[PDB]
Amino acid sequence: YKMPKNMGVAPRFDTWNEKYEPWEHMKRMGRLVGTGFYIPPEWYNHFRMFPPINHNFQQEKTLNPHNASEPTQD
Amino acid sequence: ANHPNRQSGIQFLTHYNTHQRFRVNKDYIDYMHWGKEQGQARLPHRHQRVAFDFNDQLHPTRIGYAWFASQDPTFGHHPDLSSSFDPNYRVFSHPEHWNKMFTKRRPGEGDIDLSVLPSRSLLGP
Amino acid sequence: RRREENLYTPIYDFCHRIREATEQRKRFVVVPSTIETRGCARVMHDHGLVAGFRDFHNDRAFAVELKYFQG
Amino acid sequence: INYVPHAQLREHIDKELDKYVAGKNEPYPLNFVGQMPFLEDGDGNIVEVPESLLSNHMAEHPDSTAKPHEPHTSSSISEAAAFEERMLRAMVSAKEEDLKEWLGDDSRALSETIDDISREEEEREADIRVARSMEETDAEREVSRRA
Amino acid sequence: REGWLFGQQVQLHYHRFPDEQLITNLSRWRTGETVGDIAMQQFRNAQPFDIEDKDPQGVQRPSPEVYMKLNYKNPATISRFLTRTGHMYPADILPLNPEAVVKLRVAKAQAIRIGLYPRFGNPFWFRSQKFRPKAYQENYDPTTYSTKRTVEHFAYNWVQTDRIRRYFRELEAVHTSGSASARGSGGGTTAEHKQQDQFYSPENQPISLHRNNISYMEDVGRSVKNPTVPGLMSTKGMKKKFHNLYSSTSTKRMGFSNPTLGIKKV
Amino acid sequence: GGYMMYHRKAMGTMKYSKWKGAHGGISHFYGRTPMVEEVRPNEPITLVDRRIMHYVHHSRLRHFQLFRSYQEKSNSTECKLREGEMLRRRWHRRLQKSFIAFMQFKTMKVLEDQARLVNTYGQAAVNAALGDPWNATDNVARERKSAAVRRQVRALPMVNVVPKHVATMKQIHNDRFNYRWRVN
Amino acid sequence: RQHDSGVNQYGLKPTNAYDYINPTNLINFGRGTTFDNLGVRRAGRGEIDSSPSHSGSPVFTQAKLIGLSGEEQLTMCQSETMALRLCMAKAGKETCERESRALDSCLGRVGHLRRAMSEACWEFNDWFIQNVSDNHTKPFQHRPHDWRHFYAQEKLVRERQQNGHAYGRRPKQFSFGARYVKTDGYGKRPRLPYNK
Amino acid sequence: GAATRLAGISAAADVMRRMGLTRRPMSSYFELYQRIVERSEAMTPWGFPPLFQFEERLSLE
Amino acid sequence: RRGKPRPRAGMFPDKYRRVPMLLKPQQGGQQYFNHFLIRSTNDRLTQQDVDNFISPQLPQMDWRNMSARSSEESIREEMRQLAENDVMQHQRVFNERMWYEKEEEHRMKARSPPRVLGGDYFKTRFGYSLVKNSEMTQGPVDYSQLDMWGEMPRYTSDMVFLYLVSRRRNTYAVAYTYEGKRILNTYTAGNRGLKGGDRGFRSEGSTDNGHQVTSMYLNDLLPKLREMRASEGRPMGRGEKVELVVRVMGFYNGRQGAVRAVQDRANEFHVRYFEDITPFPLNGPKMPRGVFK
RNA sequence: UAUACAAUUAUCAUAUUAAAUUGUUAAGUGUUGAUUUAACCAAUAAAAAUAUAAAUAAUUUUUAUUUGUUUUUAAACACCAUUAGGUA
RNA sequence: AUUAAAAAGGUAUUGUUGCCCACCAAUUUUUAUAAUAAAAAUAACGUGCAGUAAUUAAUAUAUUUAUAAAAAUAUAUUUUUUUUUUUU
Ligand SMILES: [Mg+2]
Ligand SMILES: [Mg+2]
Ligand SMILES: [Mg+2]
Ligand SMILES: [Mg+2]
Ligand SMILES: [Mg+2]
Ligand SMILES: [Mg+2]
Ligand SMILES: [Mg+2]
Ligand SMILES: [Mg+2]
Ligand SMILES: [Mg+2]
Ligand SMILES: [Mg+2]
Ligand SMILES: [Mg+2]
Ligand SMILES: [Mg+2]
Ligand SMILES: [Mg+2]
Ligand SMILES: [Mg+2]
Ligand SMILES: [Mg+2]
DSSP states (O other), X not given: OOOOXXXXXXXXXXXXXXXXXXXXXXXXXXXXXXXXXXXXXHHHHHHTTSOOOSSOOOTTTSOOSSSOOOSSOO | OOSTTOTTOOOSSSSSSOSSTTTOOSOOOOTTTXXXXXXXXXXXXXXXXXXXXXXXXXXXXXXXXXXXTTSOTTOOOOTTXXXXXXXXXXXXXXXXXXXXTTSOOOSSOSEEOSSSSOOOOSSOO | OOSSSOOXXXXXXXXXXXXXXXXXXXXXXXEEOOHHHHHHHHHHHHHTSSSEEEXXXXXXXXXXXXXXXXX | OOOOOSTTHHHHHHHHHTSSOSOOSSXXXXXXXXXXXXXXXXXXXXXXXXXXXXXXXXXXXXXXOOEEOOOOOOOOSOHHHHHHHHHHHHHHHHHHHHHSOOXXXXXXXXXXXXXXXXXXXXXXXXTSOOOHHHHSOSHHHHHHHHO | OOOSSXXXXXXXXXXXXXXXXXXXXXXXXXXXXXXXXXXXXXXXXXXXXXXXOSOXXXXXXXXXHHHXXXXXXXXXXXXXXXXXXXXXXXXXXXXXXXXXHHHHHHHHHXXXXXXXXXXSSOTTTTGGGGTSOOOOTTSOOSOOXXXXXXXXXXXXXXXXXXXXXXXXXXXXXXXXXXXXXXXXXXXXXXXXXXXXXXXXXXXTOOSOSSSSOOOSOOOOOOOOSOOSOOOSSOSXXXXXXXXXXXXXXXXXXXXXXXXXXXXXXX | OXXXXXXXXXXXXXXXXXXXXXXXXXXXXXXXXXXXXXXXXXXXXXXXXXXXXXXXXXXXXXXXXXXXXXXBOOHHHHHHHHHHHXXXXXXXXXHHHHHHHHHHHHHHHHHHHHHHHHHHHOHHHHHHHTTOOSSOOSHHHHHHHHHHHHHHHSOOOOOOOOOOOOOOSSOSOTTOOSSSOOOO | OOSOSSEETTXXXXXXXXXXXXXXGGGOOSSOOOSTTSSSOSOSSSSTTOOOEETTEEOOOSHHHHTSSOXXXXXXXXXXXXXXXXXXXXXXXXXXXXXXXXXXXXXXXXXXXXXXXXXHHHXXXXXXXXXXXXXXXXXXXXXXXXXXXXXXXXXXXXXXXXXXXXXXXXXXXXXXXXXXXXXXXXXOSOOOGGGO | OOOXXXXXXXXXXXXXXXXXXXXXXXXXXXXXXXXXXXXXXXSSOSOOOHHHHSOOSXXXX | OOSSOOOOGGGSOOTTTTSOGGGSSOOOOTTSHHHHHHHHHHHHHHHHHHHOOOOOOOGGGGHHHHHHHTXXXXXXXXXXXXXXXXXXXXXXXXXXHHHHHHHHHHHHHHOOOXXXXXXXXXXXXXXXXXXXXXXXXXXXXOGGGXXXXXXXXXXXXXXXXXXXXXXXXXXXXXXXXXXXXXXSOOEETTTSSSSSSSSOSTTTTOHHHHHHHHHHHHHHHHHHHHHHHHHHTOOOOSSOOEEEEEEEEOSSTHHHHHHHHHHTTTTTEEEEEEOOOOOOOSSOSOOOBOSOO
């Protein structure tokens, strides 16, 4: 049984985005700082009061090409 | 699901009578020629969708401009008023409509029904 | 389609529609319109689990609007 | 629609069998396949053959005496618009005489070159590595089997 | 994530924004090099062709009237949809509206059993060439699956550039040597240039820099084709050996040697 | 025994064997003739043939014929082969479009370059380099140049190549045009 | 930092549980491998495992594309050589260097043309690797069983036509002379399989 | 929906200058400018595959 | 070296690798350079003599021609001129081909109110909108573009039909009178020697056995033709050719060579029609089972 | 010894809302013979093309009906045995 | 002055000097005893070399065949390795 060469290291083509999505780091860093035991990085000091946009969702979870996901990149 | 003929998955957001898309005996899908504009071939066609995205347009209201007289005189054709829009529109699918299975799949062979595509022949008019 | 299979309720399927349309991050779902279904809708909109809902006195369906927060 | 009734049958059949009777003063009607078919006289003998078929008709049954059948001619405008039709058709056969083929001038000097380059390809070919399997006999096929 | 066409990860373009030509060329622009400039005008916003089949499987072919004649009694109009042998074209070679395929296979069938079409071959093959879009190698259609034509026109235009290069290299060459009148003790070339560069060298006027030259030219006539008499050793009766000829040592580290290479055919 | 015409043993030559059908003029092949070429005067038939053969080969007809006319294959293996063929075709097309979509960019860069040449030497100069008759003067020079272009543009007939047929031992494919191993 | 995020000190950085159990995969593939050559699972060029991939099957025909070195290959000058051959074959009394000059002029250009095409094609190999190739990550599309799901869809159809019964069944092949050798009462043409 | 790119570059040079990013002042502006000008000649220059654009498990050479 | 093949030449370090570039080739003759330079300059001056732009032009002397352009005749003109050339040119550079065709048409052409119908009139004509778009030629239509037998052979009571059949392991040739009478027997690649107990099967059905066979058959075909025609009273004395229809079974290798061996007989045999009859298997009786299936 | 499957996607044998069934075409004789095959042996060799619409959805067919085994070689190919035949 | 760089499988696991397959003896154990019961443990002897794309690719059904793995044919098929005409 022959496969395409690099399938061992093949990335998850649906979920590989999640890790890097801004909201994630907002939440995590949110409850990390909350402890009192972490010094907030300054980006968090900033986006604290300008949290990112709500309804932009990737094309992986929403399966539509026609959905214009981005207010910016449109 | 790795079984062939089960590949279309579980979709609840369809309009069919089963939530399991692969038992539905109505519309067999076509993996090779389909899904240019809908993304994957499994997913429902644009005009048949029962769930809607945030920044995407939803279904046009069908007519079958006179009535905008009170509006801005300039205002053009409202993007959601469509002359011809059909929720029931049969999209050509080879495994249904052109079915080559009982043949050797040579050039002319396979059984075709013509009742799907609207006739481009001159014979009608 | 056959015997051993579950017998579905327009509650079962109501829920799985909402679930799946929440997973694909859609803003609207079309959903079966019976009594306890739009009952459930009103209750959810009370508790603020759903952005809003409407019944158009369409017979089959009515439509719910989903809410998202922090991505 | 003119329906053939039972009373009118043979009259009509015969009016039809005489459609091409091998002479008339007027232009002849074509086929459903759009051909000018053989003009037979009374009783259905093959008397007049149109030009495209004459070679074969004569080659198959030589003793058959048949004529080339020319259509009756009808003249549009003058011999002037027909001579201008002659100029346009000659210009068509000219643009086609230009586009068709060159072939240089003389044949044998062309054929020489073709056969030569075919030969050159033949012996640039014979130097290609064959497959192991095509090359060897069954002696060492068997040898490698045992081994 | 894939584009539909060839599966690209990006949407194709050449340029996108209004300023990029300006911003890229900026010191040129302040300089005023760019004033009459036609390269920053012509191609500034130029984008790729649409290389796409509006009809992947033609519902457009044939155009309407053709259908009328797709019956059994139109040998010509049957023939414009077959090969020179009479067979149909595979669906993805010459795509046809399914109507046309039905009517066509039916047509050819009827036509044959009535004797109005041959059981093999295309009797209208030449006549039918008008109706076929014969695409001249000289014109370019942006949509082709022909990779040859593309590279052909690439070649053509590049060579058309090279012509210009060469014309203007040899031209000013002939104005280096052709400007020599008062150049003998003239200012046009430095005294030190008289010193160093007035000697024959690889860049100046080499003899030949290459082996296998033409020496000894003469006007003598040609000889007869094949003046030589075939040798006394027969090359014909000798069998050509390839694989087993010399002895080799396998660099195979571990595992059974791949059977497809050694043993598989026959 | 009775064989078809594309069969191996079809036209036999032996003491018993005799050829079937009216064999000349109007013949057994009467309406069964796949191609007809009237030979133009002063034209070698080697061009005629190599055009016919190139035709059949590039449209994969001689492929098909060779294939089916030698040995039997069940409808499953035949399907497997035609569909594999067609799918590899699909793949390679989707490659060609990529190549081409790049090459049209390459050509664009070339044409763009040619424009830059234009505004270095002026348009007319560029034109001169391109074979423009500005020394044309009278019509006779134009006619010499156009007689040049005439003698160029008129096409010599193509000798186009047809790959030979490789006869292997037990003939797994009689479609064999190269020595590469195939998957049957 | 000084280098890639998906490659640490000892090799590829092992994210899924397959790499913690099978950590050969972290550092090895093929013969062409170097330590900087991990995380780029494609190796250099002209090199073992340099080949770019398109829907998973690698691209080994590149030269064949630009029509350098192909059996179908692009041919620059034909009219030339045919003209000169014509002359050579006609007669031996007059000799033509008038043609040979036209021709070798032609070839003299052909050289730089070819270097150009080769160059552009290497640029294509690079562009392709950046913006198209998946680096052997996605399942093959080019063999019929990879499309099995598609075929299934049509088997399903032929079954529901048969009252939802015979899956993957086909009409029994008959005989060459099937119709015309059979007496009345027996099926002269092959039926639907459910209609046996 | 494609704005003009000048404000963007003057901004992105401004940030690197006002942030202390470089020891010698010009380097910020020069590098940012240069890197753009080289990419200007590339086929489909301003689009990028999503996976290779940035840090991810597998990368470009 | 030892029991192995010698490397290709380029696999070795350069033969002349230790000899400096100035030496290969030597540039000698440096003595003559100066001489040939002075020579060429003196020459130039002579070529200047054989034949024998700073004529000061004042701008104020031109004024009349300037006032000529301020009159709106000339500007009506420039406007007309410039509005003609604003039409979106597709040319972009001087192109040789297009020039050629253009002036070709100038040689071909040097050799060469009623009420406007409203939209309503065309609203009532259904036909017209189908005339505008139609493929079908309107006017008297050429008949040779209809008839079935238009492009097809045309035979003669005297023609010889030469059958060249190329098979996989064999090739053979025959001839027939138009009435189907066999002329000479069928010369075969295994009939002529050429085949068995020899070099191999691989080359058995090859190109040059087809050639051998055809060139051997024609050679013998001539005299018996002159005989069969001597019998009926057709002398065919001299300056005669045999009209030939070459029918070819094929797609095998023996085909190519075969027809070539006919082409060289062009001084004797005149080929009117080249038409191949090669059987195509739509479906039919089982072929013999091969190895795999 | 007792002590908590799944119910959103699971490959070997308990099917189920379906439009089919029926079409009489083709092919055949000139003559002295190495065809096919990696290789043997028996020994006339050519051939069998046409159909869409339409049939309504579900609720008591599960002892019913249904899933490539088929008369006629005086018709072949093919296949199996080896010159005798079997089968097709 | 003629050619060569880039696509590939492992039932093994420092890996083909790798592993495995059936018959062919003893024994051990349960039973629903069919040439000579069946099934399971098993480490002799003897025949081979069936399998790992594996020396006529394999897998499933079907029919036949048989020292033993298995082999022939008819279908489907890739848990086998790919080679690619958008009217020429
Ligand atoms: Mg395997
Ligand atoms: Mg691997
Ligand atoms: Mg018999
Ligand atoms: Mg590798
Ligand atoms: Mg069950
Ligand atoms: Mg017991
Ligand atoms: Mg036992
Ligand atoms: Mg085996
Ligand atoms: Mg074995
Ligand atoms: Mg095996
Ligand atoms: Mg098996
Ligand atoms: Mg079995
Ligand atoms: Mg056995
Ligand atoms: Mg078995
Ligand atoms: Mg088998």
